[PDB]
Design a protein around this ligand. Structure first.
Ligand SMILES: Nc1ccc(S(=O)(=O)N2CCN(S(=O)(=O)c3ccc(O)c(O)c3)CC2)c2nonc12
Ligand SMILES: Nc1ccc(S(=O)(=O)N2CCN(S(=O)(=O)c3ccc(O)c(O)c3)CC2)c2nonc12
Ligand SMILES: O=P(O)(O)OC[C@H]1O[C@](O)(COP(=O)(O)O)[C@@H](O)[C@@H]1O
Ligand SMILES: O=P(O)(O)OC[C@H]1O[C@](O)(COP(=O)(O)O)[C@@H](O)[C@@H]1O
Ligand SMILES: O=P(O)(O)OC[C@H]1O[C@](O)(COP(=O)(O)O)[C@@H](O)[C@@H]1O
Ligand SMILES: O=P(O)(O)OC[C@H]1O[C@](O)(COP(=O)(O)O)[C@@H](O)[C@@H]1O
Ligand SMILES: O=C([O-])C(=O)[O-]
Ligand SMILES: O=C([O-])C(=O)[O-]
Ligand SMILES: O=C([O-])C(=O)[O-]
Ligand SMILES: O=C([O-])C(=O)[O-]
Ligand SMILES: [K+]
Ligand SMILES: [K+]
Ligand SMILES: [K+]
Ligand SMILES: [K+]
Ligand SMILES: [Mg+2]
Ligand SMILES: [Mg+2]
Ligand SMILES: [Mg+2]
Ligand SMILES: [Mg+2]
Lengths: 423, 427, 425, 436
């Protein structure tokens, strides 16, 4: 029965063509949904009660569109998101962190950092936002200007550059090099370049981000008809599935959740599609290609990450449990696209929110009392990942897990991979 | 010899990549498509696309197959649509070197619960035979006996009509192999399929059916809501353009328009948009792995047509051939070339007007209808048809003097004897 | 039938990986195909008798090597005459006649920088006696090949020059030597003295790989069956060396003292024949063809385009043979570079091309002697029927077999452009 | 270039010119052949073990010391010739030569002792002389038995039974010498510790032109099973009388290593020849050149694809450690082992990195020479009070011995493989350490 679920007959195929031939509508997804859902907050999704339903439906990142609304409006949206999120903190083994992302208005008619963006970026730092979706990035100096406007207090906010025009596509490599990730902003991109070429830019950018090991977001009109209708079109469900199959780390909802009549249903639909598409991923070729393309490295976190992903595939590990301070060790595991869930146990509330940008990373915020012996404290965090995993359905007694830790406290010392039997 | 500019167009840098990941990384929005669009466009005929003048614009925009939906309208209404299509098509027939055939496909109403065919389907299928339709899109096919029922209804005069089974429910998906075995091809009818099975599972059924049809070498059509928003808006959504591109990248032979052309406000623009997207997606196909996998999955064969087809496709890839010119009576030799997915256009020269319309079902097949009287010496008649394909290709932009073409012929007249592949330099 | 798929290592041929291919190799799976790696036998006191040369031709000798390091011009002219007499004794039956090439192996430059005066005299002797191939000793650079070419003069333009790589400089300047040569000989004897003995296998494997990539003949030579000079059976290392030279990709394998002076010249030829046949069936064509296709650049030459189409068609139907019409041997060489499992039966009117194509693996030359028919299409057809009748008599073909036929659109060399699928009746 | 660019800037272009690294990074096997370079020097320690047959030419203690220094890892006693008194003296001389370098782990080289049986002859099962010779082996503490003419699984069971309850630790390597042994190979391999391709008898029992097919098939199946395979007979035959081998002989040794053999053997070359030490030096020189020419890119991918999924943590850790070693070009994989099993599971994936096996078992240290790329280190210190400290001391012993022996250098990355509790069978940890 195990080998009939999660498209495992299609996963064992020797060619991609045979993999397609073996895809089965009756093979149910079992693994937890890996691709994060970004939902835009607006009039249709601002209330605390609505936000609680959206968190339960699968929203991982709340997007604030600073093209509309005042700072007072956005501060209220932030407070409502935090209130809805913290209402589930009473059960620490099932609490779900939710990131807050600020989407800038943009440079507009000018080719420089606007005065409104400088004010909005400062608002973001003061309100503790986790991510900035920087609009209309056309070159590396645009990313540097956003970074500078965040100042010294905003040093830890992730900058996701939105590629929205021909220049951004042509200067992609230099933009990606200085960004934390990319958003394929298809709305403006489809007006700036011929509509029939947007899919080439999406596929190229997803491929280059996967190669770089940096998050990529697919955005705009994914479930557009759901703004007024309860069910999406056949093109819309295929678009969501294909963004996941292309290699996108995150999928986004704009008007569907910000102003539409069915915000919760749009989140549920993206969750349902992503789960089905993730099981249909051809890991046999994907992992070998990512493994071949990632350069040789002498960084122990990089070396441990490939060893752990290889070990997970060998035993069909239910999960890879990793301890992380900044999220980096979890991101390096994520870049190889394991079928095994990457359960990231962290003390940092910000890192727990930010790792939603990386596909297959399930953040757990550790809030248990400390152990006096560091080695005992490490083991306790590892057991916490196992208990949360058991409660959430990721793990069962008898499962094998890969555990990734470091040799000394502090960030940057991951170097150990262990094979653990559950209970 | 070819120039550096040649290797920058039609995603040739991405085509040379050693891995699919590197192929994605090398896709370029500035690399322009050069080859003729190979995925056929099926447009549904209705009030918005019925007039002769509107049909002429749709033919110019790229419509290859006209679909008549027998769920609506009387036999008198459909006979008028057929006559208007034929009048618009024949208005360009004055130039045999330029003439574009257009197939006519009848889409049945369906069984609507009950064994065998409905009485309305028997009557509509008989109308199709009497009006010389090329294809039947058979609704709600659930098993092999449903196809046998459609085949029996095609009377004594309609055995040459192609039956494309529409898979619209869970049973059709589960009994897919037995349905494909007895059908000429398949339509992934996503509208009903999305109501019969969970909406989030339709993409798995589409990808599986396209894969199995590609492996079997049989035509597969992707249908319903591909450019839905274009029924009222002049431009499609980002999800819609991606859906068309991904149907082509999945391996679909045909793409379809329903309400977009039958009742919408922008029928010609919907055809133009599908044409524009398909051209871009076809150049982005990763032929290196696709050909290798079709080659590996296809079993060994002692059929000379099948053996010649793989030799010709391999030869076309070796020289970047502008085209593969094939002589065919039934369309079979062109279909066997098509199954290996050559980048080269397959120019099919035929004397059969029906085979010229029906080969639009096979991706990359460009039919040319040959109307010259037969030569007394067969070898001369073969050479005259080969030169007709070269001169049509020159007129239409496929070929230039100095280009290499692959020519596929047989050793004697009649269908079933294809066994020769020649490499010709265009003079 | 099921029996067909149990022979010629076909279960190992279908394997998805090289490791699974090794695991499926079967000592009970008998070789069926004709032996495709040519055997070069050195002529000497043990193999100069016309009657003994007839036995070596029957055992499988394809090329007779004359080592100009020993013997006078008078001695070598006698070797040539005895070889030709033994070869021509089978000309009375044209359907089974086997051409045999004559190769002149030069003495070398010695302490000198360029072509020695003895080499200039020996090369002129070769042209005057109509030799087919020159194995040029101690080639160190492209100018050494040009000097050999110049010494052959205007009448020796058709002689093939196979450069012997025998020292470190020849290995380092390999690419420039291969570019101007017709092929290469891995002359392991001198190479093993010039460079450390434990490195010779790297130079052999590299040179075979680069020659296979270039589509040019490569000969593996020296001490392949050395112990058979005095013993009737070779050592386990010797049989493995022959098998591995074939698996590496060598077009030809050579015998030196084993046939020139040993007590078992005919048996040494039979042993090389037996091993090569076994090794050729064990070749992993699935990866080999894929890699040769991938490494070969795009081409606008119709002979080259037809060749890959014909090899792909032959693999699709398990063709028993690819029958090709050739004047210079080039169309057969372009088929050979893709390493088809199907035998390449080359029909030619050129006696020299029939001898020279033995340098290309899997090419079986047939010398056609009939004067041209008035209708060119009938002349082409009579040659293809000759290839079929020769193949049927020799065991290559049976009724019901599929064959790929490669021809051109007009008479003369350089116009191959047609591939046809034929059923043997 | 982008997949090696940063590592090329760090380690330098000279690093990437040695050990056939340009041929190693080729995308196809054809390009790998084209890039093989006679000027690319081998850097890694020789990983294929050399088995040398002991006889009149190689029996003296002083000669055995030179053979150990030249590279002999396993001493073979051929029980087809000589009395029990002769063989006991050969064993004592081997042990004396081996123990003469025992003052430090930087000079110590464990050498296994293998007993090669006379065989069944015309009889169906185990002969009475074999029963007596096998009991002699147990009484004299031999590490391995090369069982002659194994034709079926019951033949190996009979050898195992003749070793008795005290010889359960002895490894049984079945010699495949005839057609029946080849046809019943799978059942023989299943119950054996490894296989010897005994080409001498095999070449008389089956056509000589078919021996290479049997050798290649058996090596491939042993590699797939993860069990040792020995290539034997006439590898450097002419070196019995000549100081240099023939071109066929050097190619045969190189090709046995490229086929996947764990061990290569010398018979008359060391037992009775005029150049026993030179024969060992020649096999050592060829094996190092051939090991660097192995195409690890496809070999690792295929071993990975053919190996089934596993829930054994030692097996799961082994593939993770080999993958980690390839990622950083690790100088070594240091593994703690009691029976040798954890080192054998690393060895089956054919890492380019040396597998340094730290053990307290003198027998396991001798027996791991059967597995390609395993370098045994015999740990002699008494156990620490705290088990975790004892483990750490053994790992540091491997690092310090590795540095002083040239295997490791400052700045190198090493992969360390250990378990979660004492005792055999609990390996489950892989660590990445930087050498300081
Ligand atoms: N890095 C990556 C590796 C592998 C994949 S993949 O999903 O396995 N991938 C699907 C597309 N191709 S294809 O050549 O177009 C093809 C399409 C259809 C066919 O029938 C066929 O035979 C080949 C095969 C490979 C990735 N997807 O995103 N990133 C990927
Ligand atoms: N288990 C094993 C796995 C992989 C290898 S390998 O070294 O990577 N390798 C061997 C040679 N072959 S080939 O198909 O004969 C070939 C030969 C020549 C060619 O030019 C070519 O393109 C292909 C390619 C694969 C092994 N070698 O011994 N055991 C091996
Ligand atoms: O992914 P990051 O940011 O490098 O964090 C990984 C770090 O987490 C740990 O596993 C545990 O460290 P702490 O005890 O400081 O939480 C370290 O050993 C390791 O260096
Ligand atoms: O694709 P089909 O229907 O088999 O037709 C291919 C046939 O066309 C030809 O090339 C030309 O035949 P005709 O002269 O009868 O048209 C035949 O030699 C070949 O058998
Ligand atoms: O291999 P080559 O030397 O190019 O010879 C091939 C030539 O042989 C032919 O098949 C037959 O030519 P001939 O009639 O002159 O012998 C030509 O059509 C073709 O050009
Ligand atoms: O390779 P083997 O025989 O399984 O030995 C591996 C064992 O060695 C260890 O690393 C150390 O164990 P000991 O302390 O008993 O020597 C164990 O944790 C592990 O189970
Ligand atoms: O701003 C956006 O998200 C866009 O343009 O797609
Ligand atoms: O009938 C159709 O085309 C459908 O249901 O999609
Ligand atoms: O000359 C030769 O043939 C040699 O040196 O091997
Ligand atoms: O016994 C042996 O070693 C042999 O026969 O090779
Ligand atoms: K915005
Ligand atoms: K209908
Ligand atoms: K000479
Ligand atoms: K013995
Ligand atoms: Mg925008
Ligand atoms: Mg329907
Ligand atoms: Mg020489
Ligand atoms: Mg023996």
């Amino acid at each position: 029965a195990f080998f009939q679920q999660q498209q495992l007959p299609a996963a064992m195929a020797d060619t991609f063509l045979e993999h397609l031939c073996l895809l089965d509508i009756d093979s149910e997804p079992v693994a937890a949904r890996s691709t994060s859902i970004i939902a835009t907050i607006g009039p249709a999704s601002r209330s605390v009660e609505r936000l609680k339903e959206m968190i339960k439906a699968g929203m991982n990142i709340a997007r604030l569109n600073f093209s509309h609304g005042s700072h007072e409006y956005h501060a209220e949206s932030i407070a409502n998101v935090r209130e809805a999120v913290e209402s589930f903190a009473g059960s620490p083994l099932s609490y779900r962190p939710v990131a807050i992302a600020l989407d800038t208005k943009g440079p507009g008619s000018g080719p420089g950092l606007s005065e409104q963006d400088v004010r909005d970026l400062r608002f973001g730092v003061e309100h503790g936002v986790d991510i900035v979706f920087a609009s209309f990035v056309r070159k590396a100096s645009d990313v540097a200007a956003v970074r500078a406007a965040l100042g010294p207090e905003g040093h830890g906010i992730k900058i996701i550059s939105k590629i929205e025009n021909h220049e951004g596509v042509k200067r992609f490599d230099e933009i990606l090099e200085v960004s934390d990730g990319i958003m394929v902003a298809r709305g403006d991109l489809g007006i700036e370049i011929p509509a029939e070429k947007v899919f080439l830019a999406q596929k190229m950018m997803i491929g280059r981000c996967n190669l770089a090991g940096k998050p990529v977001v697919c955005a705009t009109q994914m479930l557009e008809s759901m703004i007024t209708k309860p069910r999406p079109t056949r093109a819309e469900t295929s678009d969501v599935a294909n963004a996941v199959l292309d290699g996108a780390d995150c999928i986004m909802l704009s008007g569907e959740t910000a102003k539409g009549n069915f915000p919760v249903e749009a989140v549920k639909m993206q969750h349902a599609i992503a789960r089905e598409a993730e099981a249909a991923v051809y890991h046999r070729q994907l992992f070998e290609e990512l493994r071949r393309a990632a350069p040789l490295s002498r960084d122990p976190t990089e070396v441990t990450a490939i060893g752990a992903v290889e070990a997970a595939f060998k035993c069909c590990a239910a999960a890879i449990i990793v301890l992380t301070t900044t999220g980096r060790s979890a991101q390096l595991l994520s870049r190889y696209r394991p079928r095994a869930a990457v359960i990231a146990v962290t003390r940092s509330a910000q890192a727990a929110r930010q790792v939603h940008l990386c596909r297959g990373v399930f953040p757990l915020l550790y809030r248990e009392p400390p152990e006096a012996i560091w080695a005992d404290d490490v083991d306790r965090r590892v057991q916490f990942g196992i208990e949360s995993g058991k409660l959430r359905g990721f793990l069962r007694v008898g499962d094998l897990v890969i555990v990734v830790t470091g040799w000394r406290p502090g960030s940057g010392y991951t170097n150990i991979m262990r094979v653990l039997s559950i209970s």
